[PDB]
Write a protein that binds this ligand. Structure first.
Ligand SMILES: C[S@@+](CC[C@H](N)C(=O)[O-])C[C@H]1O[C@@H](n2cnc3c(N)ncnc32)[C@H](O)[C@@H]1O
Ligand code: NA
Length: 271
């Protein structure tokens, strides 16, 4: 796979590799990633000592922020060994009396009770045959007053796009094929109904939906600018092919969020 050393060339120190939130226009990338995490965690009404599950925890930035700012116990799940190892190391290096653990484990195998759940851009990696199952499991492990913040990408169909004045081009179809045949996200995104209808069938109320479309455009622009500025080092760590493929993903996805072809949002879900 792609080395952490490559991603380090374009991500900020949190290692967060999902849509940032430019809560103030002059925030740096790091500040906007912490703002995105805090935006989500504030919606969970966390109290010190609660237990927070992060489904699909990446390299651990949100878990570290949850411990540091919110003083919660944390459990992070991932399917990626590289994600797990960095998460494990970062959490162990936090000075805290709380429980802070990362696991190489899917949510399908996790059955422990937790007080709150967060997830950032993992849901699009789930098979559509598991969308309902995921919400059922999340409902079951939460207490009666539990809350989940689902931050997910989602797509729109031709009819909706057309009603909004947007068309999918032959280039867009080529780009979707590029995504499907690569490690990059976006090849088989859920629709908004795939999120909302399954969450509601499992018993959740959708309290709030916050769209972040243009924040993602800006985030992807920042990653691309960072990667081009480090091009020689990126080629050295990987190769020119990989570098160019990443640039194609980052810039192509930025263009598509700007145009409105796809979206990303935080869904506050309550019981
Ligand atoms: C696009 S990354 C998001 C990483 C992190 N949330 C962030 O904001 O940078 C998706 C992560 O979800 C994880 N993931 C995908 N499917 C999963 C599953 N069924 N259970 C647990 N984690 C999963 C991947 O292994 C990866 O760590
Ligand atoms: Na404390």
């Amino acid at each position: 796979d792609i080395s952490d050393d490559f991603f380090a060339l374009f991500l900020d120190p949190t290692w967060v590799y999902t849509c940032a939130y430019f809560e103030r226009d002059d925030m740096t990338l790091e500040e906007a990633q912490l703002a995105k995490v805090d935006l989500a965690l504030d919606k969970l009404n966390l109290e010190p000592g609660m237990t927070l599950l992060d489904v699909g925890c990446g390299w651990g930035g949100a878990l570290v922020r949850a411990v540091e700012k919110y003083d919660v116990n944390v459990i992070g799940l991932t399917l990626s060994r590289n994600h797990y190892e960095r998460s494990k190391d970062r959490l162990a290096a936090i000075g805290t009396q709380r429980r802070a653990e990362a696991r190489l484990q899917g949510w399908e195998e996790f059955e422990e009770n937790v007080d709150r759940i967060v997830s950032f851009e993992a849901f699009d990696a789930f098979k559509k045959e598991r969308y309902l199952t995921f919400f059922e499991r999340s409902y079951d492990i939460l207490p009666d007053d539990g809350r989940m913040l689902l931050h997910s990408l989602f797509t729109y169909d031709r009819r909706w796009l057309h009603e909004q004045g947007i068309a999918l081009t032959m280039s867009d179809l080529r780009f979707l094929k590029f995504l499907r045949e690569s490690i990059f996200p976006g090849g088989e995104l859920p629709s908004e109904p795939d999120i909302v209808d399954n969450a509601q069938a499992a018993g959740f109320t959708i309290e709030h939906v916050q769209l972040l479309q243009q924040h993602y455009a800006r985030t992807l622009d920042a990653w691309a600018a960072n990667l081009q500025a480090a091009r020689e080092r990126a080629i050295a760590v990987q190769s020119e092919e990989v570098y160019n493929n990443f640039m194609h993903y980052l810039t192509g996805c930025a263009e598509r969020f700007r145009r409105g072809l796809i979206n990303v949002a935080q869904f506050t879900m309550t019981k």
